[PDB]
């Protein structure tokens, strides 16, 4: 099983809670680490975090970032820089953001800036996932 | 040990009754038959610790 530790600095949602699996859009990938799982560090992308809680319930989240930390053990810890439950997120904006984003990227000359946009684009998109 | 000896005797009888067998082929398979035993006898000692203790426990 997994002690799933789900937190952002700001909010701790599940804490070593007997969750079955979390499929995690780590920048690393989306993988569904169930239970324990070898030491691995995977850094959290923005995506949505789907917390297959050992009970057929899955809580939804958007994760923005952070890292999930994969112990060897059962306890797996998403420490998402930002992790929010999808509940509070905003399509009107998601699109809206995306438009803008896409507008900005274009002038966001230089990889970093572009990036910042792109990140953002990606972000809005990744919201757009859920939105 | 006694069981193994009986099995060998039976094999010989079957070969002697039935014609179909080259000296060669037999030489071989007979070397094959031999090999398995020796590994087994080191095992045949090793076996007992599990089973006789497991009977006693259950």
């Amino acid at each position: 099983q997994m002690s799933f530790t789900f937190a952002s600095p700001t909010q701790v949602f599940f804490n070593s809670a007997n969750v079955r699996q979390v499929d995690v859009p780590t920048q690393t990938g989306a993988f569904g680490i169930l239970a324990a799982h070898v030491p691995t560090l995977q850094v959290l992308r923005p995506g949505l975090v789907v917390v297959h809680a050992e009970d057929g319930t899955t809580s939804k989240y958007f994760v923005s970032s952070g890292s999930v930390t994969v112990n060897a053990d059962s306890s797996v810890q998403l420490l998402a820089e930002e992790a929010v439950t999808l509940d509070m997120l905003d399509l009107g904006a998601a699109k809206a953001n995306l438009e803008k984003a896409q507008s900005e990227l274009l002038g966001a000359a230089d990889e970093a800036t572009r990036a910042e946009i792109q990140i953002r684009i990606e972000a809005n998109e990744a919201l757009v996932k859920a939105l | 040990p006694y069981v193994l000896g009986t099995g060998l005797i039976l094999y010989l009888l079957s070969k002697e009754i039935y014609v179909i067998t080259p000296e060669t082929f037999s030489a071989i398979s007979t070397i094959g038959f031999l090999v398995y035993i020796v590994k087994k006898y080191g095992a045949s000692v090793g076996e007992f610790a599990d089973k006789l203790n497991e009977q006693k426990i259950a």
């Binding site: - | 070969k15 067998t21 071989i28 094959g32 009977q55």
Partner: protein, 217 residues
């Protein structure tokens, strides 16, 4: 007559003593005798019970009898000769119908048209496509059941070839042995790497298939 008649009784009797001896072990004696033999069904109830149930205790001993029977049946084609090429092949073919009927008992007997409705509704066979279901009923039974005969016949083969190549190798190098002994000593050890492994995994196929039967049963 006698030759064929003596072999099948012997095969039964070797399984009959374990199958009589274990029933006997339930109170006496044990001396050397009973406790020694208890180890036989302890190895079965140790080894195979690590996989069994699984499908449930209900089916477990039903399959374990066949699993032991297959390994014991192949072992009763090990020693005899002429026997591996003929009698063990007739026992491989004589296990063929039992292997065919093993899918029949619950699969084809209850559903011939789609024994994958008991075996596997969605998987290999397409549950949207009863055609692919039935095609692969061959590969999961009609086939694999005949290949499971061919599988022990593969062993009978590769075992026969060791023998014919050996007899031919020692006929080529009738040195007594001598240098042909080196290769032939390898060809002997190949009997373990080939027959004794693949014979194993051949009954492992019967294990898994009769597990997938009863595990979904």
């Amino acid at each position: 007559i006698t030759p064929v008649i003596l072999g099948l009784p012997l095969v039964t009797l070797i399984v009959l003593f374990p199958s009589l001896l274990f029933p006997t072990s339930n109170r006496l004696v044990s001396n050397r005798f009973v406790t020694l033999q208890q180890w036989m069904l302890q190895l079965v109830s140790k080894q195979m019970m690590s996989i069994h149930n699984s499908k449930g205790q209900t089916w477990t001993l039903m399959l374990m009898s066949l699993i032991l029977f297959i390994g014991s049946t192949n072992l009763l084609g090990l020693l005899p000769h002429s026997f591996t090429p003929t009698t063990q092949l007739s026992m491989n073919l004589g296990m063929a119908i039992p292997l065919w009927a093993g899918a029949v008992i619950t699969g084809f007997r209850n559903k011939t048209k789609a024994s994958l409705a008991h075996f596997l509704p969605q998987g290999t066979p397409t549950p949207l496509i009863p055609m692919l279901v039935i095609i692969e009923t061959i590969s999961l039974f009609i086939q694999p059941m005949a290949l499971a005969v061919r599988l022990t016949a593969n062993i009978t083969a590769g075992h026969l070839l060791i023998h014919l190549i050996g007899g031919a190798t020692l006929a080529l190098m009738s040195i007594s042995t001598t240098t042909a002994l080196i290769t032939f000593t390898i060809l002997i050890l190949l009997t373990i790497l080939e027959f004794a492994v693949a014979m194993i995994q051949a009954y492992v196929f019967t294990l898994l298939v009769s597990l997938y039967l009863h595990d979904n049963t």
